[PDB]
Write a protein that binds this ligand. Structure first.
Ligand SMILES: [Mg+2]
Ligand SMILES: [Mg+2]
Ligand SMILES: [Mg+2]
Ligand SMILES: [Mg+2]
Ligand SMILES: [Mg+2]
Ligand SMILES: [Mg+2]
Ligand SMILES: [Mg+2]
Ligand SMILES: [Mg+2]
Ligand SMILES: [Mg+2]
Ligand SMILES: [Mg+2]
Ligand SMILES: [Mg+2]
Ligand SMILES: [Mg+2]
Ligand SMILES: [Mg+2]
Ligand SMILES: [Mg+2]
Ligand SMILES: [Mg+2]
Ligand SMILES: [Mg+2]
Ligand SMILES: [Mg+2]
Ligand SMILES: [Mg+2]
Ligand SMILES: [Mg+2]
Ligand SMILES: [Mg+2]
Ligand SMILES: [Mg+2]
Ligand SMILES: [Mg+2]
Ligand SMILES: [Mg+2]
Ligand SMILES: [Mg+2]
Ligand SMILES: [Mg+2]
Ligand SMILES: [Mg+2]
Ligand SMILES: [Mg+2]
Ligand SMILES: [Mg+2]
Ligand SMILES: [Mg+2]
Ligand SMILES: [Mg+2]
Ligand SMILES: [Mg+2]
Ligand SMILES: [Mg+2]
Ligand SMILES: [Mg+2]
Ligand SMILES: [Mg+2]
Ligand SMILES: [Mg+2]
Ligand SMILES: [Mg+2]
Ligand SMILES: [Mg+2]
Ligand SMILES: [Mg+2]
Ligand SMILES: [Mg+2]
Ligand SMILES: [Mg+2]
Ligand SMILES: [Mg+2]
Ligand SMILES: [Mg+2]
Ligand SMILES: [Mg+2]
Ligand SMILES: [Mg+2]
Ligand SMILES: [Mg+2]
Ligand SMILES: [Mg+2]
Ligand SMILES: [Mg+2]
Ligand SMILES: [Mg+2]
Ligand SMILES: [Mg+2]
Ligand SMILES: [Mg+2]
Ligand SMILES: [Mg+2]
Ligand SMILES: [Mg+2]
Ligand SMILES: [Mg+2]
Ligand SMILES: [Mg+2]
Ligand SMILES: [Mg+2]
Ligand SMILES: [Mg+2]
Ligand SMILES: [Mg+2]
Ligand SMILES: [Mg+2]
Ligand SMILES: [Mg+2]
Ligand SMILES: [Mg+2]
Ligand SMILES: [Mg+2]
Ligand SMILES: [Mg+2]
Ligand SMILES: [Mg+2]
Ligand SMILES: [Mg+2]
Ligand SMILES: [Mg+2]
Ligand SMILES: [Mg+2]
Ligand SMILES: [Mg+2]
Ligand SMILES: [Mg+2]
Ligand SMILES: [Mg+2]
Ligand SMILES: [Mg+2]
Ligand SMILES: [Mg+2]
Ligand SMILES: [Mg+2]
Ligand SMILES: [Mg+2]
Ligand SMILES: [Mg+2]
Ligand SMILES: [Mg+2]
Ligand SMILES: [Mg+2]
Ligand SMILES: [Mg+2]
Ligand SMILES: [Mg+2]
Ligand SMILES: [Mg+2]
Ligand SMILES: [Mg+2]
Ligand SMILES: [Mg+2]
Ligand SMILES: [Mg+2]
Ligand SMILES: [Mg+2]
Ligand SMILES: [Mg+2]
Ligand SMILES: [Mg+2]
Ligand SMILES: [Mg+2]
Ligand SMILES: [Mg+2]
Ligand SMILES: [Mg+2]
Ligand SMILES: [Mg+2]
Ligand SMILES: [Mg+2]
Ligand SMILES: [Mg+2]
Ligand SMILES: [Mg+2]
Ligand SMILES: [Mg+2]
Ligand SMILES: [Mg+2]
Ligand SMILES: [Mg+2]
Ligand SMILES: [Mg+2]
Ligand SMILES: [Mg+2]
Ligand SMILES: [Mg+2]
Ligand SMILES: [Mg+2]
Ligand SMILES: [Mg+2]
Ligand SMILES: [Mg+2]
Ligand SMILES: [Mg+2]
Ligand SMILES: [Mg+2]
Ligand SMILES: [Mg+2]
Ligand SMILES: [Mg+2]
Ligand SMILES: [Mg+2]
Ligand SMILES: [Mg+2]
Ligand SMILES: [Mg+2]
Ligand SMILES: [Mg+2]
Ligand SMILES: [Mg+2]
Ligand SMILES: [Mg+2]
Ligand SMILES: [Mg+2]
Ligand SMILES: [Mg+2]
Ligand SMILES: [Mg+2]
Ligand SMILES: [Mg+2]
Ligand SMILES: [Mg+2]
Ligand SMILES: [Mg+2]
Ligand SMILES: [Mg+2]
Ligand SMILES: [Mg+2]
Ligand SMILES: [Mg+2]
Ligand SMILES: [Mg+2]
Ligand SMILES: [Mg+2]
Ligand SMILES: [Mg+2]
Ligand SMILES: [Mg+2]
Ligand SMILES: [Mg+2]
Ligand SMILES: [Mg+2]
Ligand SMILES: [Mg+2]
Ligand SMILES: [Mg+2]
Ligand SMILES: [Mg+2]
Ligand SMILES: [Mg+2]
Ligand SMILES: [Mg+2]
Ligand SMILES: [Mg+2]
Ligand SMILES: [Mg+2]
Ligand SMILES: [Mg+2]
Ligand SMILES: [Mg+2]
Ligand SMILES: [Mg+2]
Ligand SMILES: [Mg+2]
Ligand SMILES: [Mg+2]
Ligand SMILES: [Mg+2]
Ligand SMILES: [Mg+2]
Ligand SMILES: [Mg+2]
Ligand SMILES: [Mg+2]
Ligand SMILES: [Mg+2]
Ligand SMILES: [Mg+2]
Ligand SMILES: [Mg+2]
Ligand SMILES: [Mg+2]
Ligand SMILES: [Mg+2]
Ligand SMILES: [Mg+2]
Ligand SMILES: [Mg+2]
Ligand SMILES: [Mg+2]
Ligand SMILES: [Mg+2]
Ligand SMILES: [Mg+2]
Ligand SMILES: [Mg+2]
Ligand SMILES: [Mg+2]
Ligand SMILES: [Mg+2]
Ligand SMILES: [Mg+2]
Ligand SMILES: [Mg+2]
Ligand SMILES: [Mg+2]
Ligand SMILES: [Mg+2]
Ligand SMILES: [Mg+2]
Ligand SMILES: [Mg+2]
Ligand SMILES: [Mg+2]
Ligand SMILES: [Mg+2]
Ligand SMILES: [Mg+2]
Ligand SMILES: [Zn+2]
Lengths: 146, 119, 50, 126, 87
RNA sequence: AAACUUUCAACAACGGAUCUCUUGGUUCUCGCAUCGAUGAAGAACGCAGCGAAAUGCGAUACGUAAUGUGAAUUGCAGAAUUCCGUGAAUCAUCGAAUCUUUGAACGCACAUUGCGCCCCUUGGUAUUCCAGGGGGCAUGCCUGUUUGAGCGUCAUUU
RNA sequence: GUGGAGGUCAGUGACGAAGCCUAGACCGUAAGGUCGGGUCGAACGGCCUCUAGUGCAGAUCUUGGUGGUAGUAGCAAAUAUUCAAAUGAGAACUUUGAAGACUGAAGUGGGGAAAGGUUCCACGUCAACAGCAGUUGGACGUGGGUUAGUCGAUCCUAAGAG
RNA sequence: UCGAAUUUGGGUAUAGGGGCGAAAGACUAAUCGAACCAUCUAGUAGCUGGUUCCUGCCGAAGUUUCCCUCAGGAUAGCAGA
RNA sequence: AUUGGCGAGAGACCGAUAGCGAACAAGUACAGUGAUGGAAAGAUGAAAAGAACUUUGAAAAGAGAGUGAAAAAGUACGUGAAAUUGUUGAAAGGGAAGGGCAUUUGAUCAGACA
RNA sequence: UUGACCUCAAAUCAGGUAGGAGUACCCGCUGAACUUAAGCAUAUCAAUAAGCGGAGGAAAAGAAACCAACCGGGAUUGCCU
């Protein structure tokens, strides 16, 4: 089984592979199901906006550090500097990362100003009752693009 | 004809007990006939009636024993809910809603705030 | 055999009772479809294996 | 055009449902249309046939005949009009089996319930 | 002599009826059913015999109790009794 | 020339291709999470006015109670008091019951419808023997109750 | 040339679709196509495309069906039968009577263990079965039948099991 | 051969690279120089057999080289497009 | 994630030797000591209207009749191919038969004249 | 003599829990050979089948003794890569 001037191929089909074939027949299914799942979370979540606020972050390595990219959460430093606590910033749809450390001032001012603008562009309903219906903006990512 | 359930449910515990012996002599006699008569569908109704009295004599002595058990720890297993062998095991809402003293102070102090975006 | 257990004598009793032709009235029922008894057994043709 | 997600146009699913339908379901399947008169008389288009109704065969060979429904033969999906029958060779008589959709209802057999039904559909009555 | 003449001495059962599955697979001297493993607590079964597995799983039988767990669950395991309306 | 053999055709045989069917299968997708010592799954034997089976059920045995429907069931018989009604039905639904002999299967056995023990009760002139009725007695392990063992060991007696 | 799919011919059809038959007609080199008639009874075709579980003479091919063989091989071990009456549509074969024989108590007699499971018995009865027959049967149909303080089991122990 | 290393019933133990064998590779359920059952399994096969419509045009090789190669491959050659 | 379970919507899927082994009293009937193995089998008609009655027959049946739109649908039941068989009709045959080109004879048929 | 303590027992002691089923998917254990390598032992098949234990509606994994080497990222899982 070697003949002609053909490129040597490496078609790994010598285990019982036919046993482990995944046809994504449910691709349209699971998109319909994912859309409905979010339309329920939207409605469960009151006017709250489906996602949390994510920070700016410089991507690692010599290949992606040109770009800037949403990180996990806001570091204890940025949260404080932007004038609120970790414990509370979480209940206000702000993601906080106890693991991220601040070594670059530029990014730091960037995220602290990102927290200013977030606070200035939301409203936090009282604990009481009222619940002054105020209609959900759905993302937040979209609202405060990076 | 045939015996009716809501009509039995008014008779005394011992009227019903005698009704059964009335239907039993009744039945026992029909069976002596059924072997002379080519067919005797009468026997079906008299034997369903026995079943109906018995259900009543039993239904009554049961909701007797429920109530004189109702509202306490421990009552015969067969008056406890059936559900599922594993539903029976599941944690009761109480032992499930439990929260630690420390974490209670947390839910109170920083709870999920109802907020919205726009301005 | 000739001095059996009740379990065996019982199985034979239920056997006997299945060895009967079709009750002919069934042939008349609406949508009836059973023609003959297709599980008929005979002692000298198919042994019942206890 | 079906539109719900809980109707099935599946021709196999249907025929199974019809032939295996339980007695209680066949009662409504065996519906006859009321007669022209009776319809304006009751503000109602048709009704599950029942036994002591009065009917006129408006289809088939026994077109024109009429009579009382003798038995609803739900098992046979067929209703029997006592007055519409076959004689045989040996003189013997035998019901013809008739279908409520090819009959018309001319005089109802009225119950407490039969009326409340006619009113449940939005009718008036005499 | 290994064939027909010797078959005449076949008249002693190696197996009788298996209490747990009524199958005439109950070895007498071994005291154990070759089909279901009685009296071994677990019922005998193998992944190399998928027919014999099908030949016996739940639903090949009355399902005297399991029949109804579905309906009961469907109604949230109702304790009580239905009341009344009219008509 | 028949007979016979052969070939073609018509009509009749044999056989069940073909055509048309389809309450079945196969594959895809969506929704959902519920067996069991509160005895499961499985087995055995039974149960109808007339049933061998399939289905269903358990000595309350093709079913009992309940609820909805609103007049059937139907092969034959049948009841007839059930038709303006706490009411027909081999109906639907099902929340209440019954649920033999078994089965992880639990007093012991079980190629045996074999053999114990306790409690309440009934009859037989009977706490002790026999018989009928009811209710009981498996294993490991956890918490607790009670009763104990050991110079393991502390004190307290005169 | 076939099965299914998009489009189209507002295609064919219970006044007869599909199929099947037909040393009848016609078109094509051919694969095939068209028609007549007969049978039949509910569907079906042309053209442009799409699609594949798409074409059989073979594989000691798979399943089913059928021949020649052939009214043939054969139905010859176990000494043996015969006359009459009765029954019956029908009797070499049933029943009864008569005769001739056999097994010859190491039985072709009288009971049981194992195994069968109703074959036992009666009444009815011959479509299949009993490699001729059948009025007979261990067949078919419908019923009846198995009675225990002392016969067995149950109790005991054996090799052994556990 | 026929009074014993005799025949035989039932019960019981020995199980598959194992048993049992006064030893024949015998016997272990018509299976024995490794039982039966299912599965891995549609095992592999340089070998054998078969491989289904018509017409039209072109149309070969049994030679070279290397091969644990010699009933097979690769390579060139001849062939079509 | 999901060749199990409960409930649903589907398909350029199979169409009774196919599709699951099973569209049916199918994991049945049957085999085996056992583990296991495991079939075949759907379709009268709109409706039984499933053939009264007469006649021959011991009966089964045949022959009339009758039902039906049809018995060229008779519970052997839609259509009912082939191998193979009976009858009738035609024809040929001195150790096979069948085939090619050609024509006589017999049978049969298209078309074209006008 | 009397009362504790420690450790260990017994009850048809009071109340409970475990077994078995199923197993498509999930957590583990255990574990081949056919096969491929044109022979074959490493290798391959395959950390697969068969065997064993244990769960759920999912299981498991999961808030870094992590990735990195950057201007650093920031629980887990899954897809595209
Ligand atoms: Mg090359
Ligand atoms: Mg791969
Ligand atoms: Mg491989
Ligand atoms: Mg999938
Ligand atoms: Mg989805
Ligand atoms: Mg999101
Ligand atoms: Mg940075
Ligand atoms: Mg990067
Ligand atoms: Mg409020
Ligand atoms: Mg439970
Ligand atoms: Mg409890
Ligand atoms: Mg005996
Ligand atoms: Mg068997
Ligand atoms: Mg046996
Ligand atoms: Mg609607
Ligand atoms: Mg409706
Ligand atoms: Mg309506
Ligand atoms: Mg009916
Ligand atoms: Mg009709
Ligand atoms: Mg022999
Ligand atoms: Mg042998
Ligand atoms: Mg033995
Ligand atoms: Mg053992
Ligand atoms: Mg056990
Ligand atoms: Mg078990
Ligand atoms: Mg099981
Ligand atoms: Mg069960
Ligand atoms: Mg409930
Ligand atoms: Mg009402
Ligand atoms: Mg002459
Ligand atoms: Mg021909
Ligand atoms: Mg046929
Ligand atoms: Mg067909
Ligand atoms: Mg049709
Ligand atoms: Mg389908
Ligand atoms: Mg869907
Ligand atoms: Mg019965
Ligand atoms: Mg029934
Ligand atoms: Mg019920
Ligand atoms: Mg009845
Ligand atoms: Mg009444
Ligand atoms: Mg009511
Ligand atoms: Mg009711
Ligand atoms: Mg019902
Ligand atoms: Mg009871
Ligand atoms: Mg029950
Ligand atoms: Mg026990
Ligand atoms: Mg017992
Ligand atoms: Mg004993
Ligand atoms: Mg007393
Ligand atoms: Mg006394
Ligand atoms: Mg007792
Ligand atoms: Mg304790
Ligand atoms: Mg103590
Ligand atoms: Mg086509
Ligand atoms: Mg046809
Ligand atoms: Mg013809
Ligand atoms: Mg011709
Ligand atoms: Mg022509
Ligand atoms: Mg021609
Ligand atoms: Mg032409
Ligand atoms: Mg034609
Ligand atoms: Mg024609
Ligand atoms: Mg035609
Ligand atoms: Mg038709
Ligand atoms: Mg077309
Ligand atoms: Mg094309
Ligand atoms: Mg093919
Ligand atoms: Mg060919
Ligand atoms: Mg061909
Ligand atoms: Mg073919
Ligand atoms: Mg062929
Ligand atoms: Mg051939
Ligand atoms: Mg060929
Ligand atoms: Mg052939
Ligand atoms: Mg022949
Ligand atoms: Mg002859
Ligand atoms: Mg001869
Ligand atoms: Mg001879
Ligand atoms: Mg002789
Ligand atoms: Mg002599
Ligand atoms: Mg005479
Ligand atoms: Mg003779
Ligand atoms: Mg003489
Ligand atoms: Mg004599
Ligand atoms: Mg002599
Ligand atoms: Mg003698
Ligand atoms: Mg002698
Ligand atoms: Mg003798
Ligand atoms: Mg005797
Ligand atoms: Mg016998
Ligand atoms: Mg006798
Ligand atoms: Mg007799
Ligand atoms: Mg005869
Ligand atoms: Mg015989
Ligand atoms: Mg004979
Ligand atoms: Mg004869
Ligand atoms: Mg008999
Ligand atoms: Mg009898
Ligand atoms: Mg004795
Ligand atoms: Mg005893
Ligand atoms: Mg042991
Ligand atoms: Mg060895
Ligand atoms: Mg080996
Ligand atoms: Mg070994
Ligand atoms: Mg053999
Ligand atoms: Mg071996
Ligand atoms: Mg064997
Ligand atoms: Mg192959
Ligand atoms: Mg070679
Ligand atoms: Mg080879
Ligand atoms: Mg060519
Ligand atoms: Mg040339
Ligand atoms: Mg070399
Ligand atoms: Mg060499
Ligand atoms: Mg060769
Ligand atoms: Mg070269
Ligand atoms: Mg060239
Ligand atoms: Mg699925
Ligand atoms: Mg869909
Ligand atoms: Mg579906
Ligand atoms: Mg099939
Ligand atoms: Mg075929
Ligand atoms: Mg096909
Ligand atoms: Mg098959
Ligand atoms: Mg069907
Ligand atoms: Mg079936
Ligand atoms: Mg089996
Ligand atoms: Mg079977
Ligand atoms: Mg059969
Ligand atoms: Mg048909
Ligand atoms: Mg047919
Ligand atoms: Mg029809
Ligand atoms: Mg029909
Ligand atoms: Mg006449
Ligand atoms: Mg006449
Ligand atoms: Mg005739
Ligand atoms: Mg017509
Ligand atoms: Mg016709
Ligand atoms: Mg006729
Ligand atoms: Mg026809
Ligand atoms: Mg007939
Ligand atoms: Mg026909
Ligand atoms: Mg010659
Ligand atoms: Mg010529
Ligand atoms: Mg002219
Ligand atoms: Mg206790
Ligand atoms: Mg388990
Ligand atoms: Mg497992
Ligand atoms: Mg391994
Ligand atoms: Mg392989
Ligand atoms: Mg390799
Ligand atoms: Mg190799
Ligand atoms: Mg090789
Ligand atoms: Mg090798
Ligand atoms: Mg590999
Ligand atoms: Mg490895
Ligand atoms: Mg694999
Ligand atoms: Mg495995
Ligand atoms: Mg969960
Ligand atoms: Mg669960
Ligand atoms: Mg989820
Ligand atoms: Mg940490
Ligand atoms: Mg990460
Ligand atoms: Zn068993």
């Amino acid at each position: 089984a070697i003949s002609k001037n053909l490129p040597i191929l490496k078609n790994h089909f010598r285990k019982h592979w036919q046993e482990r074939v995944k046809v994504h027949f449910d691709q349209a299914g699971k998109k319909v199901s994912r859309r409905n799942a979010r339309a329920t979370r939207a409605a469960k979540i009151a006017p709250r906006p489906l996602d949390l606020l994510r920070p700016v972050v410089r991507a690692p390595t010599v290949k992606y550090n040109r770009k800037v990219r949403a990180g996990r959460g806001f570091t204890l430093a940025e949260v404080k500097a932007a004038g609120l606590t970790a414990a509370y910033a979480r209940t206000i749809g702000i993601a906080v990362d106890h693991r991220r450390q601040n070594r670059n001032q530029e990014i730091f001012d960037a995220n602290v100003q990102r927290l200013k603008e977030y606070q200035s562009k939301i409203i936090v309903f009282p604990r009481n009752g009222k619940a002054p219906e105020a209609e959900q903006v759905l993302s937040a990512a979209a609202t405060f693009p990076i | 004809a045939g015996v009716k359930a809501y009509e039995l449910r008014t008779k005394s515990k011992e009227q019903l007990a005698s009704q059964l012996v009335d239907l039993k002599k009744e039945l026992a006699e029909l069976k002596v006939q059924k072997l002379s008569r080519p067919s005797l569908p009468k026997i079906k109704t008299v034997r369903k009636s026995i079943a109906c009295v018995l259900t009543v004599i039993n239904e009554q002595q049961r909701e007797a024993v429920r109530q004189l058990y109702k509202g306490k720890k421990y009552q015969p297993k067969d008056l406890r809910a059936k559900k599922t062998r594993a539903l029976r095991r599941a944690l009761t809402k109480f032992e499930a809603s439990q929260v630690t003293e420390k974490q209670r102070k947390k839910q109170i102090a920083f709870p999920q705030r109802k907020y919205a975006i726009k301005a | 055999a000739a001095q059996k257990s009740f379990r065996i004598k019982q199985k034979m009793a239920k056997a006997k009772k299945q060895n009967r032709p079709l009750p002919q009235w069934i042939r008349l029922r609406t949508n009836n479809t059973i023609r003959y008894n297709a599980k008929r057994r005979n002692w000298r043709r198919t042994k019942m294996n206890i | 055009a079906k539109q719900s997600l809980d109707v099935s146009s599946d021709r196999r699913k249907a025929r199974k449902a019809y032939f295996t339908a339980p007695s209680s379901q066949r009662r409504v399947l065996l519906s006859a249309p009321l007669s022209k008169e009776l319809r304006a008389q009751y503000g109602i288009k048709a009704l599950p046939i029942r036994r002591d109704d009065e009917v006129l065969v408006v289809r088939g060979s026994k077109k024109g005949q009429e009579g009382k429904i003798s038995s609803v033969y739900r098992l046979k999906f067929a209703v029997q009009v006592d007055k519409v029958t076959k004689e045989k060779v040996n003189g013997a008589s035998v019901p013809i089996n008739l279908h409520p959709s090819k009959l018309v209802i001319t005089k109802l057999h009225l119950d407490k319930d039969r009326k409340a039904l006619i009113q449940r559909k939005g009718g008036k009555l005499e | 002599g290994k064939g027909t003449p010797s078959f005449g001495k076949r008249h002693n059962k190696s197996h009788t009826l298996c209490n747990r599955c009524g199958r005439r697979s109950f070895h007498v001297q071994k005291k154990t059913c070759s089909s279901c493993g009685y009296p071994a607590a677990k019922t005998r079964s193998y992944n190399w015999g998928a027919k014999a597995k099908r030949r016996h799983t739940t639903g090949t039988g009355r399902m005297r109790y399991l029949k109804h767990v579905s309906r009961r669950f469907k109604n949230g395991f109702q304790t009580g009794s239905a009341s009344k309306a009219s008509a």
